[PDB]
Structure 1
Amino acid sequence: SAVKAARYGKDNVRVYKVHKDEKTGVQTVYEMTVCVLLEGEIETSYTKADNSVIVATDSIKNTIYITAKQNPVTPPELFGSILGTHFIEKYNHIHAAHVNIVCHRWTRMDIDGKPHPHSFIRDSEEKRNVQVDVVEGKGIDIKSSLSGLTVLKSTNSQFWGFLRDEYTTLKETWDRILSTDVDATWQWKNFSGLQEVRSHVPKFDATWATAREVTLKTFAEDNSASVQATMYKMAEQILARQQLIETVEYSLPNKHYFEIDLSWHKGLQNTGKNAEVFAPQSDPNGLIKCTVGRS
């Protein structure tokens, strides 16, 4: 037996950081959960009880906090690059650092029409994420995402013309509900290293903002032929708005809302154009996925 792959590190490290401004007395809060896993010359920790090669998970945890103290934690693509870079440079035998960050929302409250200096609400469970893979002499690979963006539209979604065979019972429809939790991911052109990441910093926030705006617009506006068809259109527009993106990937549950036939009860009319009351189905769910690239 031989180790074919191994990585190890610290997961679920919660981090908060505050910035306090001088002139303004305005405060800004940032909260994330971090995972850093390491690869390199570590097989012997597995094979020969040889702990000498292990940078302790505990130490990795310390290093996340220290790093957060020493640098801005925003945007997470930068923070993750910085953090990941630290590990491969500091330790000879460590050849890759994989950093996952989930950013939690803390949105400034408006009180009596004006933004509060130091009070925040978690205004959605929606997250902003990165996966930052820092690989020694292979550069920095970044995937940015939004996830947990839960949306519904009450009309202007259709699904007809699919294969019908001896397995099919689904009725065609020209007017249904569409609901999903959006998980959208954009993969950056490889960066040669930390310096290169630093040259692009403003694009990170801008491309997140774009991806979200494009998701919501296309979802709201598209008289959708299918989930397949609507996600495609979103991805097209995202690629067309940022050249440093190689691929855009959506993963979309179809969270079904069934009509309820009430006609058995006093001829109550609640289907087709009369449909008002629906039963949201917790399971199962359609799951539709797509990765889109340049020709």
Structure 2
Amino acid sequence: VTIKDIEVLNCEYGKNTIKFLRLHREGKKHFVKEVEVCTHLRLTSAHEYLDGNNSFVIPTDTIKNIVLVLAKKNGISSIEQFAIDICKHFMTTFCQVAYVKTYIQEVPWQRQYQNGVPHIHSFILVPDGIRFCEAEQCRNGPLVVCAGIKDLKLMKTTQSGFEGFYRNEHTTLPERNDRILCGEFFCKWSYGECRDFDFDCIWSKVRECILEAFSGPPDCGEYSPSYQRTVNCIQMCVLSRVPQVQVIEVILNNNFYNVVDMKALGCTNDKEVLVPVETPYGSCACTLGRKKYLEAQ
């Protein structure tokens, strides 16, 4: 078996988990953006694999250096603009690059407040969902930017059921019109090539849409007839309220909370003590796109 008998379907390399903090000072007031960056390249040749020839390979160490240099020279107005700047640098600098993908997540530092007063230079880690983005470009193709939020755990204690599902000989699940709906969410949305707007302002607005659609109104909530329907309500709320979102993917990993039978312990448990099942767990996932955007492709 030689190079003649085999096809190269895919080659990809890069640098993962480049961690750094970009500090910005407006007099005594300090601002931080701490990020984790992964940048992957596909080269137009595979001589490093096929021939043991490294002439075209950009060291992963150089990828790291370029990420740090760009953060120093340009600052980080948004992780999206930083991801764009990194992909642009690789495409305009190195003709051996066929494809570049940059992934960035924010370390979720918040400014400390003492009795409602913002601290000039003190922060606390508050992971209430991780902000990320992804930029990718093929040689002479569109630079496509996605933003998202992952590890976002939302729970409501009622206005959730699952009824009228397909029944067969291996279906023991009872019908329920009241249950805890507890979800870990992964949400990712494409802007396509739109790059004009306030990335931070749009991300916050999408996040608000996710929480509002999940919960329903604060005085009464809204019935969810399935995890899948709640995923749909979230996607349709984002697309209704945020025109810059062209495509939205939502993944919901759920935890069932079991009302433990306490009859043998001599008491009745009227939805008072509930035990979460972490494993195994259900997931559902949907990607919706605007007809207009998909046609214009």
Choose the corresponding residue for 2:277, options 274, 281, 284. Answer: 281
Q: Return 5+ residue gaps in structure 2 as ranges.
A: 1-5, 217-221, 292-297
Following superposition of structure 1 onto structure 2, how do residues 181-200 of structure 1 map, counting pairs within 5 Å?
Answer: 181-189=184-192, 191=193, 197=195, 200=196
Question: How many residues are treated as equivalent by the alignment?
Answer: 281
**RMSD, aligned α-carbons:** 1.4
Identify which of 206, 224, 239 aligns with 1:211.
206
1:75-101 alpha-carbon deviations (Å, 9 max, x no partner): 111100001110111112112211011
Counterpart check, 1:293 vs 2:275: no
Q: Whole-Å Cα distance in 2 between the matches of residues 238 and 101 of structure 1?
A: 22
Residue among 133, 138, 142 paired with 2:136: 133
Cα distance between partner residues in 1 of 2:74 and 2:148: 22
- Alignment partners' CA distance in 1, 2:178 and 2:60: 53
2:214/2:233 contact within 8 Å kept: no
Q: Per-residue deviation at 1:125?
A: 5.3
**TM-score, length basis structure 1:** 0.91
Instruction: For 1:105 and 1:181, locate their aligned partners in 2 and report how far apart those are by CA, in whole Å.
Output: 17
The residue that corresponds to 1:123 in the other structure is 126
Contact 2:18 2:37 in 1 (8 A): yes
What is the correspondence of 1:182-261 to structure 2 with a 5 Å cutoff?
182-189=185-192, 191=193, 197=195, 200-202=196-198, 204-221=199-216, 222-261=222-261
Superposed CA offset, 1:126-161 (max 9, x none):
211111102221020112110011111111111111
Aligned counterparts, 1:256-275, within 5 A? 256-266=256-266, 268-270=267-269, 274-275=270-271
- Corresponding residue of 2:20: 15
Partners of 1:42 and 1:73 lie apart in 2 by: 33
Deviates more, 1:125-134 or 1:282-291: 125-134
For residues 44-59 of structure 1, what are the structure 2 equivalents within 5 Å? 44-59=47-62
Structure 1, residues 101-146: CA drift from partner, whole Å, max 9, x if none?
Answer: 1111110000132000010111125211111102221020112110
Residue 232 of structure 1 aligns with an amino acid whose one-letter code is N
**1:153-192 correspondence to structure 2 within 5 Å:** 153-189=156-192, 191=193
**2:69 aligned with 1:66:** yes
- Structure 1 distance, partners of 2:239, 2:210, is 12
Shift of 1:211: 1.6
- Give me the whole-angstrom Cα distance separating, in 2, the residues matched to 1:89 and 1:283: 47
